[PDB]
Amino acid sequence: IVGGRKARPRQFPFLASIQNQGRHFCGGALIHARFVMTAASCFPGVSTVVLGAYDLRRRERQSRQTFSISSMSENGYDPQQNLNDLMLLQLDREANLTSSVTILPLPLQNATVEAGTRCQVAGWGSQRSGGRLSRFPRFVNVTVTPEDQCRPNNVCTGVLTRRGGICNGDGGTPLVCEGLAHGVASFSLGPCGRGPDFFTRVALFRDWIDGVLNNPGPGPA
Numbered sequence: 001i002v003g004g005r006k007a008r009p010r011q012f013p014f015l016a017s018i019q020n021q022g023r024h025f026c027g028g029a030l031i032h033a034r035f036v037m038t039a040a041s042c043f044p045g046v047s048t049v050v051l052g053a054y055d056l057r058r059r060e061r062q063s064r065q066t067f068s069i070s071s072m073s074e075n076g077y078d079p080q081q082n083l084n085d086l087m088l089l090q091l092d093r094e095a096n097l098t099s100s101v102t103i104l105p106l107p108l109q110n111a112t113v114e115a116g117t118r119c120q121v122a123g124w125g126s127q128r129s130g131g132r133l134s135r136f137p138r139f140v141n142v143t144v145t146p147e148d149q150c151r152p153n154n155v156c157t158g159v160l161t162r163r164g165g166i167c168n169g170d171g172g173t174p175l176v177c178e179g180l181a182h183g184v185a186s187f188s189l190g191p192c193g194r195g196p197d198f199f200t201r202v203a204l205f206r207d208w209i210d211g212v213l214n215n216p217g218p219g220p221a
Protein backbone atom coordinates (compact mmCIF):
# COMPACT_ATOMS: atom_id res chain seq x y z
CA ILE A 1 0.00 0.00 0.00
CA VAL A 2 1.21 3.43 -1.00
CA GLY A 3 0.12 6.55 0.79
CA GLY A 4 -1.30 4.67 3.74
CA ARG A 5 -0.94 4.37 7.51
CA LYS A 6 0.34 1.50 9.64
CA ALA A 7 -2.51 -0.70 10.78
CA ARG A 8 -3.05 -1.81 14.37
CA PRO A 9 -3.19 -5.46 15.43
CA ARG A 10 -6.60 -6.97 14.54
CA GLN A 11 -7.73 -3.83 12.72
CA PHE A 12 -8.39 -6.00 9.60
CA PRO A 13 -8.91 -9.44 11.10
CA PHE A 14 -10.25 -10.99 7.88
CA LEU A 15 -7.02 -10.37 6.03
CA ALA A 16 -4.98 -13.21 4.58
CA SER A 17 -1.32 -13.37 3.64
CA ILE A 18 -0.73 -15.81 0.73
CA GLN A 19 2.80 -17.17 0.85
CA ASN A 20 5.17 -19.15 -1.36
CA GLN A 21 7.87 -20.89 0.70
CA GLY A 22 7.07 -18.45 3.48
CA ARG A 23 7.32 -15.29 1.25
CA HIS A 24 4.18 -13.12 1.08
CA PHE A 25 3.13 -12.47 -2.56
CA CYS A 26 -0.59 -11.61 -2.39
CA GLY A 27 -3.40 -10.91 0.03
CA GLY A 28 -6.94 -12.16 0.39
CA ALA A 29 -9.85 -12.24 2.77
CA LEU A 30 -11.49 -15.02 4.74
CA ILE A 31 -15.09 -15.11 3.39
CA HIS A 32 -16.25 -18.41 4.94
CA ALA A 33 -14.77 -20.67 7.57
CA ARG A 34 -13.25 -22.81 4.81
CA PHE A 35 -12.54 -20.31 2.04
CA VAL A 36 -10.30 -17.35 1.24
CA MET A 37 -11.11 -14.97 -1.62
CA THR A 38 -8.19 -13.60 -3.63
CA ALA A 39 -7.21 -12.73 -7.21
CA ALA A 40 -6.68 -15.35 -9.89
CA SER A 41 -3.83 -13.20 -11.15
CA CYS A 42 -1.93 -14.26 -7.97
CA PHE A 43 -1.63 -17.77 -9.40
CA PRO A 44 1.31 -20.36 -7.63
CA GLY A 45 1.79 -24.10 -7.02
CA VAL A 46 2.28 -24.84 -3.43
CA SER A 47 1.32 -21.85 -1.50
CA THR A 48 0.07 -21.39 2.03
CA VAL A 49 -2.51 -19.12 3.63
CA VAL A 50 -1.81 -17.25 6.85
CA LEU A 51 -4.66 -15.71 8.86
CA GLY A 52 -4.33 -13.70 12.05
CA ALA A 53 -0.99 -12.18 11.08
CA TYR A 54 0.24 -8.73 12.03
CA ASP A 55 4.04 -8.53 11.49
CA LEU A 56 5.00 -10.80 8.65
CA ARG A 57 8.44 -11.38 10.19
CA ARG A 58 7.11 -12.60 13.59
CA ARG A 59 5.81 -16.04 14.52
CA GLU A 60 2.76 -14.81 16.39
CA ARG A 61 1.75 -18.27 17.53
CA GLN A 62 -1.23 -17.32 19.62
CA SER A 63 -2.74 -15.14 16.87
CA ARG A 64 -2.01 -16.94 13.60
CA GLN A 65 -3.65 -19.78 11.83
CA THR A 66 -1.93 -21.39 8.85
CA PHE A 67 -3.42 -23.49 6.06
CA SER A 68 -2.65 -25.44 2.99
CA ILE A 69 -4.86 -24.99 -0.08
CA SER A 70 -7.02 -28.05 -0.86
CA SER A 71 -8.60 -26.62 -4.04
CA MET A 72 -8.85 -23.45 -6.12
CA SER A 73 -11.86 -22.23 -8.02
CA GLU A 74 -12.23 -19.50 -10.69
CA ASN A 75 -14.99 -18.38 -13.03
CA GLY A 76 -13.61 -17.69 -16.47
CA TYR A 77 -10.50 -15.69 -15.53
CA ASP A 78 -8.91 -14.12 -18.63
CA PRO A 79 -5.39 -12.88 -17.86
CA GLN A 80 -5.10 -11.10 -21.22
CA GLN A 81 -8.05 -8.84 -20.48
CA ASN A 82 -7.61 -8.89 -16.71
CA LEU A 83 -11.19 -10.12 -16.60
CA ASN A 84 -12.89 -12.13 -13.89
CA ASP A 85 -9.85 -11.80 -11.65
CA LEU A 86 -11.19 -13.81 -8.77
CA MET A 87 -10.07 -17.02 -7.08
CA LEU A 88 -11.43 -18.93 -4.12
CA LEU A 89 -9.00 -20.99 -2.05
CA GLN A 90 -10.49 -23.86 -0.07
CA LEU A 91 -8.46 -24.21 3.14
CA ASP A 92 -7.45 -27.61 4.46
CA ARG A 93 -9.84 -27.22 7.43
CA GLU A 94 -12.19 -24.65 8.92
CA ALA A 95 -10.53 -21.62 10.40
CA ASN A 96 -11.33 -20.86 14.00
CA LEU A 97 -13.10 -17.50 14.50
CA THR A 98 -11.08 -15.57 17.06
CA SER A 99 -10.40 -11.95 17.92
CA SER A 100 -7.66 -12.02 15.21
CA VAL A 101 -9.48 -14.08 12.54
CA THR A 102 -12.93 -13.11 11.29
CA ILE A 103 -15.01 -13.50 8.14
CA LEU A 104 -15.53 -10.54 5.80
CA PRO A 105 -19.14 -10.37 4.49
CA LEU A 106 -20.01 -10.08 0.83
CA PRO A 107 -22.36 -7.94 -1.19
CA LEU A 108 -25.47 -9.51 -2.66
CA GLN A 109 -25.48 -10.34 -6.35
CA ASN A 110 -25.56 -7.22 -8.51
CA ALA A 111 -25.22 -4.80 -5.57
CA THR A 112 -23.69 -1.48 -6.55
CA VAL A 113 -21.35 1.02 -5.01
CA GLU A 114 -21.73 4.52 -6.40
CA ALA A 115 -18.97 6.87 -7.41
CA GLY A 116 -17.96 8.91 -4.40
CA THR A 117 -18.35 5.99 -1.93
CA ARG A 118 -15.54 5.94 0.61
CA CYS A 119 -13.79 2.61 1.11
CA GLN A 120 -10.52 1.28 2.54
CA VAL A 121 -7.89 -1.10 1.27
CA ALA A 122 -5.27 -2.73 3.50
CA GLY A 123 -2.32 -4.99 2.85
CA TRP A 124 1.34 -5.82 3.28
CA GLY A 125 2.36 -4.56 -0.17
CA SER A 126 5.15 -2.21 -1.11
CA GLN A 127 5.10 1.61 -1.29
CA ARG A 128 6.48 1.81 -4.81
CA SER A 129 6.73 -0.55 -7.77
CA GLY A 130 9.74 -2.80 -7.14
CA GLY A 131 10.10 -1.78 -3.50
CA ARG A 132 10.10 -3.95 -0.42
CA LEU A 133 6.93 -5.24 1.18
CA SER A 134 5.80 -3.79 4.47
CA ARG A 135 6.18 -6.13 7.45
CA PHE A 136 3.15 -4.48 9.09
CA PRO A 137 -0.22 -4.17 7.41
CA ARG A 138 -0.95 -0.66 6.05
CA PHE A 139 -4.24 0.90 4.97
CA VAL A 140 -5.52 3.78 2.93
CA ASN A 141 -8.85 5.54 2.43
CA VAL A 142 -9.95 5.37 -1.20
CA THR A 143 -12.97 6.67 -3.13
CA VAL A 144 -14.88 4.91 -5.93
CA THR A 145 -14.35 6.59 -9.28
CA PRO A 146 -16.88 7.59 -11.90
CA GLU A 147 -17.85 4.65 -14.07
CA ASP A 148 -16.36 6.26 -17.13
CA GLN A 149 -12.89 5.92 -15.61
CA CYS A 150 -13.47 2.23 -15.01
CA ARG A 151 -15.01 -0.76 -16.80
CA PRO A 152 -18.01 -2.90 -15.87
CA ASN A 153 -16.03 -5.93 -14.60
CA ASN A 154 -14.27 -3.75 -12.03
CA VAL A 155 -14.81 -1.31 -9.22
CA CYS A 156 -12.18 1.45 -9.50
CA THR A 157 -10.82 3.75 -6.83
CA GLY A 158 -8.65 6.76 -6.39
CA VAL A 159 -7.28 9.03 -3.70
CA LEU A 160 -7.01 12.81 -3.35
CA THR A 161 -3.25 12.62 -2.66
CA ARG A 162 -0.67 12.23 -5.43
CA ARG A 163 0.04 8.58 -4.70
CA GLY A 164 -2.22 6.30 -2.73
CA GLY A 165 -3.52 2.78 -3.28
CA ILE A 166 -2.32 -0.74 -3.99
CA CYS A 167 1.11 -1.92 -4.94
CA ASN A 168 3.19 -5.10 -5.29
CA GLY A 169 2.01 -7.68 -2.74
CA ASP A 170 -1.49 -6.22 -2.43
CA GLY A 171 -2.98 -8.29 -5.27
CA GLY A 172 -5.96 -10.15 -4.01
CA THR A 173 -6.56 -7.98 -0.97
CA PRO A 174 -10.15 -6.83 -0.49
CA LEU A 175 -11.67 -3.42 -1.07
CA VAL A 176 -14.06 -2.82 1.84
CA CYS A 177 -16.91 -0.35 1.43
CA GLU A 178 -19.84 -0.07 3.83
CA GLY A 179 -18.62 -3.15 5.70
CA LEU A 180 -18.61 -5.42 2.64
CA ALA A 181 -16.00 -6.91 0.26
CA HIS A 182 -16.93 -5.01 -2.91
CA GLY A 183 -13.61 -5.56 -4.59
CA VAL A 184 -10.59 -7.82 -4.95
CA ALA A 185 -7.37 -5.96 -5.83
CA SER A 186 -6.43 -6.74 -9.40
CA PHE A 187 -4.19 -4.21 -11.11
CA SER A 188 -3.28 -0.56 -11.59
CA LEU A 189 -1.40 1.13 -14.46
CA GLY A 190 1.57 3.39 -14.15
CA PRO A 191 3.22 4.07 -10.83
CA CYS A 192 1.51 2.61 -7.84
CA GLY A 193 -0.98 5.04 -6.45
CA ARG A 194 -1.34 7.32 -9.49
CA GLY A 195 -4.82 5.93 -10.10
CA PRO A 196 -7.18 4.45 -10.60
CA ASP A 197 -6.81 1.10 -8.84
CA PHE A 198 -8.83 -1.68 -10.44
CA PHE A 199 -10.60 -4.20 -8.22
CA THR A 200 -12.67 -7.15 -9.42
CA ARG A 201 -16.31 -6.29 -8.87
CA VAL A 202 -17.25 -8.90 -6.28
CA ALA A 203 -20.98 -8.34 -6.52
CA LEU A 204 -21.00 -9.68 -10.10
CA PHE A 205 -19.79 -13.06 -8.79
CA ARG A 206 -21.87 -13.59 -5.62
CA ASP A 207 -24.07 -16.38 -6.92
CA TRP A 208 -20.98 -18.15 -8.32
CA ILE A 209 -19.14 -17.69 -5.02
CA ASP A 210 -22.12 -19.16 -3.16
CA GLY A 211 -22.00 -22.21 -5.43
CA VAL A 212 -18.38 -22.81 -4.44
CA LEU A 213 -18.99 -22.20 -0.76
CA ASN A 214 -21.95 -24.58 -0.61
CA ASN A 215 -20.16 -27.34 -2.63
CA PRO A 216 -16.82 -27.78 -0.94
CA GLY A 217 -14.34 -30.24 -2.39
CA PRO A 218 -11.72 -30.41 -5.13
CA GLY A 219 -14.15 -30.95 -7.98
CA PRO A 220 -14.15 -33.50 -10.77
CA ALA A 221 -11.21 -35.90 -10.66
Ligand SMILES: *[C@@H]1O[C@H](CO)[C@@H](O[C@@H]2O[C@H](CO)[C@@H](O)[C@H](O)[C@H]2NC(C)=O)[C@H](O)[C@H]1NC(C)=O
Pocket (backbone or CB within 6 Å): 004, 005, 139, 140, 141
Ligand atom coordinates in the same frame (compact mmCIF):
# COMPACT_ATOMS: atom_id res chain seq x y z
C1 LIG B 1 -9.79 7.97 6.65
O1 LIG B 1 -10.84 8.97 6.64
C2 LIG B 1 -11.25 9.27 7.99
C3 LIG B 1 -12.39 10.16 7.57
O2 LIG B 1 -11.91 11.43 7.21
C4 LIG B 1 -10.08 10.05 8.63
O3 LIG B 1 -10.42 10.37 10.02
C5 LIG B 1 -10.27 11.71 10.35
O4 LIG B 1 -8.89 12.09 10.48
C6 LIG B 1 -8.79 13.58 10.53
C7 LIG B 1 -7.25 13.81 10.67
O5 LIG B 1 -6.72 12.81 11.49
C8 LIG B 1 -9.42 13.96 11.89
O6 LIG B 1 -9.19 15.38 12.05
C9 LIG B 1 -10.92 13.55 11.88
O7 LIG B 1 -11.54 13.89 13.10
C10 LIG B 1 -10.95 12.06 11.69
N1 LIG B 1 -12.35 11.54 11.70
C11 LIG B 1 -12.48 10.24 12.19
C12 LIG B 1 -13.81 9.65 11.86
O8 LIG B 1 -11.46 9.80 12.64
C13 LIG B 1 -8.94 8.95 8.79
O9 LIG B 1 -7.89 9.59 9.42
C14 LIG B 1 -8.54 8.57 7.38
N2 LIG B 1 -7.52 7.48 7.51
C15 LIG B 1 -6.41 7.45 6.72
C16 LIG B 1 -5.54 6.24 6.81
O10 LIG B 1 -6.21 8.34 5.96
Ligand SMILES: *[C@@H]1O[C@H](CO)[C@@H](O)[C@H](O)[C@H]1NC(C)=O
Pocket (backbone or CB within 6 Å): 109, 110
Ligand atom coordinates in the same frame (compact mmCIF):
# COMPACT_ATOMS: atom_id res chain seq x y z
C1 LIG C 1 -27.74 -9.65 -12.17
O1 LIG C 1 -27.62 -8.89 -13.34
C2 LIG C 1 -27.37 -9.78 -14.48
C3 LIG C 1 -26.95 -8.96 -15.63
O2 LIG C 1 -27.91 -7.97 -15.93
C4 LIG C 1 -28.71 -10.57 -14.69
O3 LIG C 1 -28.54 -11.47 -15.79
C5 LIG C 1 -28.96 -11.43 -13.44
O4 LIG C 1 -30.21 -12.11 -13.57
C6 LIG C 1 -29.08 -10.46 -12.23
N1 LIG C 1 -29.09 -11.34 -11.06
C7 LIG C 1 -30.02 -11.22 -10.07
C8 LIG C 1 -29.97 -12.22 -9.02
O5 LIG C 1 -30.89 -10.47 -10.14
Ligand SMILES: [Cl-]
Pocket (backbone or CB within 6 Å): 106, 107, 108, 111
Ligand atom coordinates in the same frame (compact mmCIF):
# COMPACT_ATOMS: atom_id res chain seq x y z
CL1 LIG D 1 -25.64 -5.85 -0.44
